[PDB]
Amino acid sequence: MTAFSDLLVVQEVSPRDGLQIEPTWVPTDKKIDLINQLSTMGFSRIEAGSFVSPKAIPNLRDGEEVFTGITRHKDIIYVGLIPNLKGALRAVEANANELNLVLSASQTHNLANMRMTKAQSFAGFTEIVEQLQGKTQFNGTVATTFGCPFEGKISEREVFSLVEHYLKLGIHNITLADTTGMANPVQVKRIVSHVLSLISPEQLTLHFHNTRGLGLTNVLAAYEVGARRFDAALGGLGGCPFAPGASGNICTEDLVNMCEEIGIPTTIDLDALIQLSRTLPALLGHDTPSQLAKAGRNTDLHPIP
Amino acid sequence: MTAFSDLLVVQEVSPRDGLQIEPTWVPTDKKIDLINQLSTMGFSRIEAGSFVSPKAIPNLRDGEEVFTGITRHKDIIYVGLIPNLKGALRAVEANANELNLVLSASQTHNLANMRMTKAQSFAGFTEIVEQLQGKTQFNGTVATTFGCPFEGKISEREVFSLVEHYLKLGIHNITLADTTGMANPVQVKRIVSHVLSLISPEQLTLHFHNTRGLGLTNVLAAYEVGARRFDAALGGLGGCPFAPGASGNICTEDLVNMCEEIGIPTTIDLDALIQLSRTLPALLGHDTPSQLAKAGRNTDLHPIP
Numbered sequence: 384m385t386a387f388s389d390l391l392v393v394q395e396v397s398p399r400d401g402l403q404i405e406p407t408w409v410p411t412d413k414k415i416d417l418i419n420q421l422s423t424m425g426f427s428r429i430e431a432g433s434f435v436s437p438k439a440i441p442n443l444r445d446g447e448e449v450f451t452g453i454t455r456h457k458d459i460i461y462v463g464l465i466p467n468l469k470g471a472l473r474a475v476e477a478n479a480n481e482l483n484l485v486l487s488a489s490q491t492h493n494l495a496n497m498r499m500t501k502a503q504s505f506a507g508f509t510e511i512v513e514q515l516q517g518k519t520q521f522n523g524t525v526a527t528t529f530g531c532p533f534e535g536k537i538s539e540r541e542v543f544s545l546v547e548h549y550l551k552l553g554i555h556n557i558t559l560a561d562t563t564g565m566a567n568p569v570q571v572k573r574i575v576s577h578v579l580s581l582i583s584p585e586q587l588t589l590h591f592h593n594t595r596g597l598g599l600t601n602v603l604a605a606y607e608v609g610a611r612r613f614d615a616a617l618g619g620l621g622g623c624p625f626a627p628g629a630s631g632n633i634c635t636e637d638l639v640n641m642c643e644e645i646g647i648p649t650t651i652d653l654d655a656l657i658q659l660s661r662t663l664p665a666l667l668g669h670d671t672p673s674q675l676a677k678a679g680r681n682t683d684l685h686p687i688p
Numbered sequence: 689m690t691a692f693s694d695l696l697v698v699q700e701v702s703p704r705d706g707l708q709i710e711p712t713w714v715p716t717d718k719k720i721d722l723i724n725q726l727s728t729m730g731f732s733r734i735e736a737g738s739f740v741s742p743k744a745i746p747n748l749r750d751g752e753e754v755f756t757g758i759t760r761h762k763d764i765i766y767v768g769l770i771p772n773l774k775g776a777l778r779a780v781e782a783n784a785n786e787l788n789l790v791l792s793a794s795q796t797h798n799l800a801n802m803r804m805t806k807a808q809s810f811a812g813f814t815e816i817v818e819q820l821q822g823k824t825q826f827n828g829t830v831a832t833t834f835g836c837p838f839e840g841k842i843s844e845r846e847v848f849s850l851v852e853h854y855l856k857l858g859i860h861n862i863t864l865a866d867t868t869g870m871a872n873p874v875q876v877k878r879i880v881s882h883v884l885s886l887i888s889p890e891q892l893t894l895h896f897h898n899t900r901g902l903g904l905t906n907v908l909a910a911y912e913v914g915a916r917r918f919d920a921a922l923g924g925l926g927g928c929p930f931a932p933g934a935s936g937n938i939c940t941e942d943l944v945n946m947c948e949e950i951g952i953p954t955t956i957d958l959d960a961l962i963q964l965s966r967t968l969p970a971l972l973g974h975d976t977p978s979q980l981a982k983a984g985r986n987t988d989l990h991p992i993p
């Protein structure tokens with residue numbers, strides 16, 4: 384019988400991770416339109432943008448107007464990505480429902496991406512919590528959890544130390560991110576099992592990129608050891624411009640199709656999501672790495688010759 | 689400790705499944721060159737071509753000359769795909785080491801692909817065995833095992849009945865093929881577990897296409913219940929021209945990378961295979977769906993800015 388604990392919670396990040404690396408600018412009102420459409424698909428969380436330097440990520444420099452302009456569904460948490468105190472204050476002014484703080488477990492990647500050390504990142508996070516606790520809610524992301532494109536292997540003890548530091552600040556919602564798609568299923572089971580001894584399945588998000596084709600295999604491996612919250616991008620958009628060779632997030636409609644075929648519950652309308660994904664080539668001017676947008680679902684049968 | 693039973697046996701099908709649907713003709717001597725290169729990569733089996741109607745599959749109409757021209761490595765079985773007695777006789781004349789007989793579990797797909805019923809296909813197989821048993825060796829493939837692009841759901845009892853019919857002819861090596869990428873991991877575990885009560889892991893091949901992005905997830909699910917032999921195509925080439933919307937086989941180098949990262953043994957040289965896959969765009973005039981050819985393996989690190 385279906386159990387409350389079975390639900391896989393699909394969280395949408397195409398407006399942020401998807402668009403930050405897209406070659407072409409997406410106009411502000413079309414970003415708003417995309418989020419308004421995603422808001423009809425069943426997601427509990429949508430990462431609607433970032434509050435970062437416009438010199439670093441020019442594609443997301445309209446975050447304030449995007450957050451101002453979208454239709455707020457009462458049962459959706461609209462998340463903004465935050466690197467420091469200045470971004471946190473911007474996000475609160477824009478009434479982001481949740482601030483997603485981000486640093487990398489790799490010192491080299493944190494310097495390349497945030498232009499500061501991990502210690503400096505956490506110094507900012509401490510000030511953010513001191514000023515804004517009780518005025519908003521927080522998520523703590525550890526990027527390059529499963530390896531780094533610069534440093535290679537990443538110490539799992541260091542990942543856990545960073546998670547514990549988030550907890551010490553009272554931030555118990557945690558994302559582990561595979562920024563350049565370096566994770567494998569055995570490694571995922573080991574890391575997720577250990578982090579789930581610190582926090583609960585309601586608190587842990589896994590954020591996989593599909594750079595080496597293991598994205599959905601890693602989702603299922605994490606699910607098998609109890610993880611339930613997963614980030615994905617419509618059409619398989621995404622990648623970080625400062626992680627070399629980064630590529631798309633796992634594709635939302637491919638993830639939802641996997642769940643639907645296996646029997647894992649989601650609250651996402653798959654048919655409607657595929658239709659929305661198929662509008663992306665016209666919006667962006669190129670095709671996207673979505674298998675379901677190309678092929679359709681199993682029940683899309685073909686006429687007999 | 690490493691066990692004899694742990695090895696995942698990677699079997700290469702790009703010269704047949706990969707090329708049959710490619711838009712452009714690959715010249716005969718370049719087909720031979722490709723197989724000669726694949727023969728250096730560690731495969732125990734390479735499907736070097738087909739002996740089918742040139743009206744049906746014009747891209748593979750040079751099968752006799754390909755089999756004549758390749759360098760035969762003594763420890764590799766060169767397989768030819770066979771639909772009927774005429775093709776079997778051609779394959780024996782070309783000294784194929786193994787004849788891969790194919791029919792579909794879907795009557796509609798078998799008629800579309802082979803222009804005969806399943807009963808007619810097995811009538812041919814019976815004559816093939818009667819004439820050529822003891823002169824060659826056989827594999828029996830059941831296509832559309834996991835669903836059909838025309839009929840939709842496919843009876844698992846019917847799949848098992850077809851496997852049993854192969855066994856009655858003395859053909860105990862069996863391939864279950866997911867022709868248009870309709871399989872999911874739970875279904876795979878159920879079907880593979882049952883077939884492994886009839887034949888051994890040394891006898892069963894799984895042949896997955898990646899049409900809905902579940903190819904490697906289905907491989908790992910099959911491996912978890914004891915399957916060990918898997919077909920894959922270099923660069924993710926492949927698809928059947930008579931199965932509508934068919935798309936690539938699972939990508940060989942993505943499969944081998946998954947094994948290498950998890951710790952599943954293979955006998956494939958991954959570095960050399962990636963280098964070979966990266967020659968495909970120049971050969972075919974377009975890029976291929978290989979994640980590893982695009983991104984490189986984890987240990988390909990990037991310079992610090």
Ligand SMILES: CC(C)(COP(=O)(O)OP(=O)(O)OC[C@H]1O[C@@H](n2cnc3c(N)ncnc32)[C@H](O)[C@@H]1OP(=O)(O)O)[C@@H](O)C(=O)NCCC(=O)NCCS
Pocket residue numbers: 403433434435436437439440466467469470471485496497498623624625
């Ligand atoms: C963290 C970050 C802001 C540091 O950049 P920096 O230029 O070294 O930061 P400094 O504080 O030295 O620069 C200060 C300037 O940037 C502005 N700035 C600082 N933080 C900002 C923020 N969060 N949003 C917007 N502007 C910001 C300051 O107001 C100031 O503007 P000025 O030039 O007119 O004075 C930048 O590296 C960044 O935005 N990184 C995130 C990139 C990203 O999102 N990557 C992908 C997802 S992780």
Ligand SMILES: CC(C)(COP(=O)(O)OP(=O)(O)OC[C@H]1O[C@@H](n2cnc3c(N)ncnc32)[C@H](O)[C@@H]1OP(=O)(O)O)[C@@H](O)C(=O)NCCC(=O)NCCS
Pocket residue numbers: 708738739740741742744745771772774775776790801802803928929930
């Ligand atoms: C099975 C198949 C040969 C039946 O085709 P068909 O045209 O209905 O077959 P017929 O026996 O009625 O046609 C006989 C003609 O084809 C030839 N032929 C029959 N089987 C052949 C074979 N295996 N190889 C080459 N020629 C063959 C006959 O010699 C004859 O040639 P002719 O026209 O000069 O007389 C054809 O459907 C086929 O090759 N299908 C396989 C397609 C495939 O490989 N799909 C993807 C992988 S499953």
Ligand SMILES: [Zn+2]
Pocket residue numbers: 400560562590592621622623632
């Ligand atoms: Zn990301």
Ligand SMILES: [Zn+2]
Pocket residue numbers: 705865867895897926927928937
């Ligand atoms: Zn195939």
